[PDB]
Design a protein around this ligand. Structure first.
Ligand SMILES: [Mg+2]
Ligand SMILES: [Mg+2]
Ligand SMILES: [Mg+2]
Ligand SMILES: [Mg+2]
Ligand SMILES: [Mg+2]
Ligand SMILES: [Mg+2]
Ligand SMILES: [Mg+2]
Ligand SMILES: [Mg+2]
Lengths: 141, 38, 131, 92, 136
RNA sequence: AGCCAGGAUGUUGGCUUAGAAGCAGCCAUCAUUUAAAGAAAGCGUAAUAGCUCACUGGUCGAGUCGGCCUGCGCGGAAGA
């Protein structure tokens, strides 16, 4: 395994193929072209779900293309369809925006365990619960 | 430099020095913050 | 840093772990990565839980104040960075080798894997353990 | 919350200022059927004492000529602008 | 600009600003700007130092103004000889003896209450100091 | 005092989709892995990135800070 060659990530909802206004220049800032992030990018977008931001590693080399392995979508963007309100934070303590219980977030926590790193399920459970705490969702424990 | 009668520490890297009787404020980051007197 | 009591608590906590322990293993991440941090300590979760305190504070008088009371041979290990990974369940567990095995699995270095104290030995990779 | 204090002999404008410009300041103890007692005491102690909020509530035992008298601070005169006491009234 | 709404007499004597102040204790608010020095504060200075506090602490917090002018100051026009009447009232002042609490704050942090009073003190002529509401 | 030293994956997180994205404007001010890390004190960005400050830290080796009370001095301080 190599050190920091360069590979910085940054992309939008995976369904939106070939993003020029959102990402654009940063996508093909290096010697890697713009067109590859459309054919190869939607190779693993179509398996799980579209209209969902999912991160992928961009380890560029001097050949032409790059090697890559994906991970897992973020906490809050998952907590819109899962939470209910498209909005999240805004004015949490001044005005509690929403609420989620432990039973949902504990169940949603373990599905990311391929990417997520921790000791027990209950360890990551309170973290992935925790990610709700600051979307105005004081966890209903 | 400035020759103001109330020199003071503007940024974090600014440093107060008494050279030859006169109080100066020499700096590393911004050469602007270099200032004499007072 | 906090009061003499707060630091005495941390060492006196470490001394009680040696009383109910046996095998230990060094580890030095001169160029560490927080992805590696969740492998050798993830292991501790796979063993059982939180109790396995790695306690990386081998300062010449900090963790070596507890040395005089428990296992005097560890004073010479003090030089260079070292972490006294104290074990609990299973006499001579598999936690010793995993530091040496992880060192190959993207961790740069690991204190030259010198080891701690069961037969009072030095740098030896030992697969011969109870399993 | 225990302070040693001397008994006053000269008392007025002239004495009190001489005293107040000697790291000390005048106070008085009074209460009950007994007569009042004028009490000279050190400044640098009582200045550090008043920072605690207990000083203006709890009972203080002032040591005078051996005898420890129990009192509470009833009134107090601050110096107009400088952070320092001028006088304290101890109720018994 | 602060000024008395109507008065008995338009013009007042000069007088003498002697003795010590009376509003020494920090009465209403938590903190206060005490006048160490002696002098007189114009109506403009008070407003100028109020604006400097108010804008430093933002909308949050509450401010008191313990001093109020109620003393008219006359001034003679340019190129006018002596006598031929007392001059015309130009501005209004508050006489400040040592010890007088000028301003008092409430509902703010101690570290950020000081920074506000420095900015006020910068506007005033009199040498000032910070004071806290003690007990008794 | 120094000083090879750590100071995270999702946070493009919500919300005015022109991005606000630890540091412009709306509060939260997560909890994990833990030797530690505020979802952040400042710099830097069209925003990121990237430097850091609190701090776990590895050493050296015991005195160090930040205010009061202040008696003498210092600058501010240019004319025929
Ligand atoms: Mg010279
Ligand atoms: Mg008169
Ligand atoms: Mg008066
Ligand atoms: Mg009165
Ligand atoms: Mg006329
Ligand atoms: Mg000092
Ligand atoms: Mg002087
Ligand atoms: Mg000149």
């Amino acid at each position: 395994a190599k050190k920091v060659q360069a590979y910085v990530k940054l992309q939008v909802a995976a369904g939106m193929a070939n993003p020029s206004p959102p990402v654009g220049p940063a996508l093909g800032q290096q010697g890697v072209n713009i067109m590859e992030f459309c054919k190869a990018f939607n190779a693993k977008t179509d398996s799980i779900e579209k209209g969902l931001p999912i991160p992928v590693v961009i380890t560029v080399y001097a050949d032409r293309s790059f090697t890559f392995v994906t991970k897992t979508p973020p906490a809050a963007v998952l907590l819109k369809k899962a939470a209910g309100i498209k909005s999240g934070s805004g004015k949490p303590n001044k005005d509690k925006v929403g609420k989620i219980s432990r039973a949902q977030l504990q169940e949603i926590a373990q599905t990311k365990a391929a990417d997520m790193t921790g000791a027990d399920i209950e360890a990551m459970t309170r973290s992935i619960e925790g990610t709700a705490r600051s979307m105005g969702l004081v966890v209903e424990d | 430099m400035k020759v103001r009668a109330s020199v003071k520490k503007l940024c974090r890297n600014c440093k107060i020095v008494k050279r030859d009787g006169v109080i100066r404020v020499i700096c590393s980051a911004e050469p602007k913050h270099k200032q004499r007197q007072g | 840093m906090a009061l003499n009591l707060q630091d005495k608590q941390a060492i006196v906590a470490e001394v009680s772990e040696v009383a109910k322990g046996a095998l230990s293993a060094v580890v030095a991440d001169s160029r560490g990565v927080t992805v590696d941090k969740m492998t050798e300590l993830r292991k501790a979760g796979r063993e059982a839980g939180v109790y396995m305190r790695v306690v990386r504070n081998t300062l010449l008088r900090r963790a070596v104040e507890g040395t005089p009371f428990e296992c005097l041979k560890d004073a010479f290990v003090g030089p260079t960075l070292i972490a006294y990974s104290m074990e609990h369940p299973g006499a001579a567990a598999r936690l010793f080798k995993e530091f040496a095995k992880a060192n190959a699995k993207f961790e740069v270095k690991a204190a030259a894997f010198e080891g701690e104290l069961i037969p009072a030995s030095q740098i030896d990779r030992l697969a011969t353990l109870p399993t | 919350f225990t302070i040693n204090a001397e008994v006053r002999k000269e008392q007025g404008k002239g004495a009190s200022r001489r005293l107040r410009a000697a790291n000390k300041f005048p106070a008085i103890i009074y209460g009950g059927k007994e007569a009042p007692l004028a009490i000279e005491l050190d400044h640098d102690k009582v200045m550090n004492m008043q920072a605690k909020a207990e000083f203006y509530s709890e009972v203080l035992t002032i040591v005078v000529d051996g005898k420890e008298i129990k009192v509470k601070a009833q009134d107090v005169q601050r110096h107009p602008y400088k952070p320092k006491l001028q006088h304290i009234d101890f109720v018994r | 600009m602060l000024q008395p709404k109507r008065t008995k007499f338009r013009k007042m004597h000069k007088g003498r600003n002697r003795g010590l102040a009376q509003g020494t204790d920090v009465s209403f608010g938590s903190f206060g700007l005490k006048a160490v020095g002696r002098g007189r504060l114009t109506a403009r200075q008070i407003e100028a130092a109020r604006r400097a506090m108010t804008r430093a602490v933002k909308r949050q917090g509450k401010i008191w103004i313990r001093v109020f002018p109620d003393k008219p100051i006359t001034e003679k026009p340019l190129a006018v000889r002596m006598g031929k009447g007392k001059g015309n009232v130009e501005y209004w002042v508050a006489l400040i003896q040592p010890g007088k609490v000028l301003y008092e704050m409430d509902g703010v942090p101690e570290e950020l209450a000081r920074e506000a009073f420095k900015l006020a003190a910068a506007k005033l002529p009199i040498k000032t100091t910070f004071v806290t509401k003690t007990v008794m």
